[PDB]
Design a protein around this nucleic acid. Structure first.
Ligand SMILES: [Mg+2]
Ligand SMILES: [Mg+2]
Ligand SMILES: [Mg+2]
Ligand SMILES: [Mg+2]
Ligand SMILES: [Mg+2]
Ligand SMILES: [Mg+2]
Ligand SMILES: [Mg+2]
Ligand SMILES: [Mg+2]
Ligand SMILES: [Mg+2]
Ligand SMILES: [Mg+2]
Ligand SMILES: [Mg+2]
Ligand SMILES: [Mg+2]
Ligand SMILES: [Mg+2]
Ligand SMILES: [Mg+2]
Ligand SMILES: [Mg+2]
Ligand SMILES: [Mg+2]
Ligand SMILES: [Mg+2]
Ligand SMILES: [Mg+2]
Ligand SMILES: [Mg+2]
Lengths: 65, 36, 188, 127
RNA sequence: GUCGGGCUCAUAACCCGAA
RNA sequence: UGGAGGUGAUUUAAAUG
RNA sequence: GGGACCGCCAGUGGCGAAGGCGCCCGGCUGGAACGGGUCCGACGGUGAGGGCCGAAGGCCAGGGGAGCGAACCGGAUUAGAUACCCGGGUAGUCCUGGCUGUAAAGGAUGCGGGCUAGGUGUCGGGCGAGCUUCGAGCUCGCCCGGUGCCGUAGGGAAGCCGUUAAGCCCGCCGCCUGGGGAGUACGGCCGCAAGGCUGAAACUUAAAGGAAUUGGCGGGGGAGCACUACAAGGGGUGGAGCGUGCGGU
């Protein structure tokens, strides 16, 4: 109901049709898979140390070149 | 028919296979009228 | 009502055949015990005899009799796993197959598939000689043994070892296996 | 003891089907496809639809006493494509997450030793 | 169908408004 | 360094001067 | 229960005059290479006429019909869509006995013989040496015959060919003589038919055709860039009245 926070630890690269998307590796901070590292796609400027609120933690983005 | 492979080239002409089909169609009409 | 229909079903215990140990291999549901006959279950040889080596050997057991909540089975056939035999066939090697119809000493009809992998590419005449050695060994074993003894020696690897020892004299070998067995008929 | 079943996964480019039976295969425990969890044809073969269907099927199986499954995944095969669609692996991961234990995993795509002629002509689809 | 405007280097197709 | 073959694929529509 | 087809191993690998030939076991049968102080003794090459073989499709009789699928019947796309795409579907694709004799049937390169640097793979046979788990096994070298690649002299318009010649020489047969009209008309032979082989003229025309060069372009590939590009944003023009410029009248 309130999402799960995750901390960005590495920047992978830019993607999307117009370059507006960034792929990152995040570490889950709370919930069932606390400690798991997964990669996600993000819209907007982001740096190492940011925190996202994921509404679910079972989808992982396809690895980009 | 005799072979003329130069006719198969496409620059400035229609496809030889269909020219051949048209010629054979025309020859059938002449042979039918020759029988009457 | 659908849930009610599921509540009419009882669970039956399935047992392996007598000469494989007769151990419990699983459970299956059914409302009427007559519908349990002729069902088939697939289990690996690692499940019966505990060893982390023979995990690619698959045996098929078919239910033939139901008594109480117990279901008893007979041996139907055997196969090696697809991914296993796929890892054996390589380029710059030679694969030799032989498919033979046999009868056991106690009147059982079987079909047996054997396979040999040679170290390098070989000539056609050498493949024929190896196939002939395979045929002779399998016919002799069928003449000697009963159904139960033949099946056990086929799945343990004894027949394959005899084949490899015999076929060395044509060409050095990389592998030798009884690839598949199916039962066709049983004695009257 | 332990009641174990079998998960049959059929995965093509157009849809995904997840079907849980008992150990012998003769009795159906649950059955869900992509068109039962989404409303658009285009989304039927996606990984997310596969996850949703696998979750529904796994819950229905768990309510009836199944503890684990062995997995058989297949592409259409025969004279059609031999490669599974994008939903198979997502379906496999979702079954374990929902609470089922996982046994052995194998591919059972039917493969001919030179069978029948496929559709399209000697020229194939021309797009 | 008529008239007018968009889009195109321009015409056809296409989009919009109107009587 | 440079070559010869094989199997897979190819995300709507788009005429003219 | 049924009809068709034999995956991986599989290799500029093998066999055949070419077309073509790939599941296993048994029988009948054709050709070639290697080894050869065996036999015959020029018995050879090419080949006008003539003869035989010859993919797919088609035709004539009798069977068979899983899958695919000319024609055709529906659903879409589009300005139209007699198509491309999707759902069905007759002939045909398969077997037995015949006819037809056609392909970019292309190595686009007719066949026999002698001669003219090398290097390096691979298939069959033979010889020598060394290993060996004693295997119809493995490694290296040499001879002969097949099958690829790089390349010297020479050849060629060049691309390229180069002891598997498109090089130098000794033979025989077939074909060509600017582009079109035309592989047509007329005449003949062959075929059940569809069609096959043979084949002009009047007239028209300054090129047609080949190999390679520099650019330009592509609903080809790769790299880079711009708020007169986009993406993220802030403010607007397009509707009204009026200032001013342009078309028309
Ligand atoms: Mg010429
Ligand atoms: Mg649906
Ligand atoms: Mg199109
Ligand atoms: Mg216009
Ligand atoms: Mg002649
Ligand atoms: Mg169709
Ligand atoms: Mg059909
Ligand atoms: Mg050919
Ligand atoms: Mg060629
Ligand atoms: Mg020729
Ligand atoms: Mg040799
Ligand atoms: Mg040869
Ligand atoms: Mg040679
Ligand atoms: Mg050369
Ligand atoms: Mg002339
Ligand atoms: Mg005539
Ligand atoms: Mg602009
Ligand atoms: Mg913008
Ligand atoms: Mg205004």
């Amino acid at each position: 109901d309130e999402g799960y926070p995750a901390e960005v630890i590495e920047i992978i690269g830019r993607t999307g049709t117009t370059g507006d998307v960034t792929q990152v590796k995040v570490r889950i901070l709370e919930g069932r898979d606390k400690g798991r590292v997964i990669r996600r796609n993000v819209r907007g400027p982001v740096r190492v140390g940011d925190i996202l609120i994921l509404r679910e933690t079972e989808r992982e983005a396809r690895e980009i070149k | 028919m005799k072979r003329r492979p130069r006719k198969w080239k496409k620059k400035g002409r229609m496809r030889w296979k269909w020219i051949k089909k048209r010629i054979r169609r025309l020859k059938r009409q002449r042979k039918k009228e020759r029988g009457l | 009502a659908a849930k009610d229909k599921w509540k009419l079903k009882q669970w039956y215990v399935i047992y392996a055949p007598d000469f494989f140990g007769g151990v419990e291999v699983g459970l299956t549901p059914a409302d009427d015990p007559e519908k349990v006959l002729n069902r088939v279950v697939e289990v690996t040889l690692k499940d019966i005899t505990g060893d982390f080596l023979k995990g690619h050997v698959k045996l098929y057991f078919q239910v033939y009799d139901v008594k109480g909540q117990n279901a008893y089975t007979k041996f139907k056939g055997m196969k090696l796993a697809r991914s296993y035999i796929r890892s054996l066939v390589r380029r710059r090697t030679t694969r030799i197959d032989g498919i033979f119809n046999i009868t056991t000493k106690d009147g059982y009809k079987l079909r047996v598939m054997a396979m040999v992998i040679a170290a390098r590419r070989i000539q056609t005449s050498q493949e024929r000689a190896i196939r002939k050695i395979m045929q002779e060994i399998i016919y002799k074993k069928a003449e000697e043994l009963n159904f139960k003894d033949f099946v056990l020696e086929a799945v343990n690897g004894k027949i394959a070892a005899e084949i490899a020892k015999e076929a060395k004299k044509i060409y050095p070998l990389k592998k030798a296996e009884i690839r598949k067995i199916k039962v066709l008929g049983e004695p009257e | 003891k332990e009641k174990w079943g079998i998960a049959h996964i059929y995965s093509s480019y157009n849809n995904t089907i997840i079907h849980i039976t008992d150990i012998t295969g003769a009795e159906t425990i649950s059955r869900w496809s992509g068109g039962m969890v989404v409303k658009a044809d285009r989304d039927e073969p996606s990984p997310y639809a596969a996850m949703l269907a696998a979750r529904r099927a796994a819950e229905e199986a768990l309510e009836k006493g199944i503890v684990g499954v062995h997995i058989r995944v297949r592409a259409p095969g025969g004279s059609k494509s031999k490669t599974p669609g994008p939903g198979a692996q997502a379906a496999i991961r979702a079954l374990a997450r929902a609470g089922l234990k996982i046994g052995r995993v194998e591919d059972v795509t039917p493969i001919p030793h030179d069978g029948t002629r496929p559709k399209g002509g000697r020229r194939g689809r021309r797009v």
